[PDB]
């Protein structure tokens with residue numbers, strides 16, 4: 001409807017797939033080559049469904065910071081016959097706060113969903129479902145199950161993926177450029 005939603009749609013329509021694990025359907029962001037991200041709590045195994053196609057997982061890493069604290073991002077390399085548009089140049093280099101963010105989700109259940117979540121806070125530490133978690137972004141929107149893996153964008157930047165919420169607020173794990181140095 002405006003430039004915020006224009007940037008979000010541009011990411012969703014080229015750089016997401018529907019990922020299915022035994023824990024459910026997730027919005028999965030593709031970053032470059034056959035490399036994609038998903039919340040760690042999706043529990044990625046050796047085989048994953050990608051747009052309902054059985055797909056071997058070539059590698060997967062649940063990321064932690066150098067303090068050995070959970071980041072709640074799993075980076076997946078997919079045995080797929082097609083590369084993602086390379087969007088690594090939209091990723092921020094540093095931890096930050098933002099204005100005017102959009103949370104965008106695409107599953108069988110929530111296709112073509114865009115939420116204007118507003119101001120994004122560099123919240124930092126959160127006890128997320130009993131897991132100490134670092135580099136958490138917070139927005140004041142009442143997010144619901146089905147939105148995990150949702151992409152958080154400003155105009156010009158892909159800043160994070162939705163990983164949880166408490167009924168009043170939503171929580172995203174930061175994406176940083178340094179996660180995807182080739």
Ligand SMILES: Cc1cccc(NC(=O)[C@H]2CCCN2)n1
Nearest residue numbers: 041072128129130131133163164
């Ligand atoms: C069903 C299940 C099994 C094991 C662990 C969990 N969840 C967690 O640890 C959290 C904290 C970080 C995000 N999800 N949930």
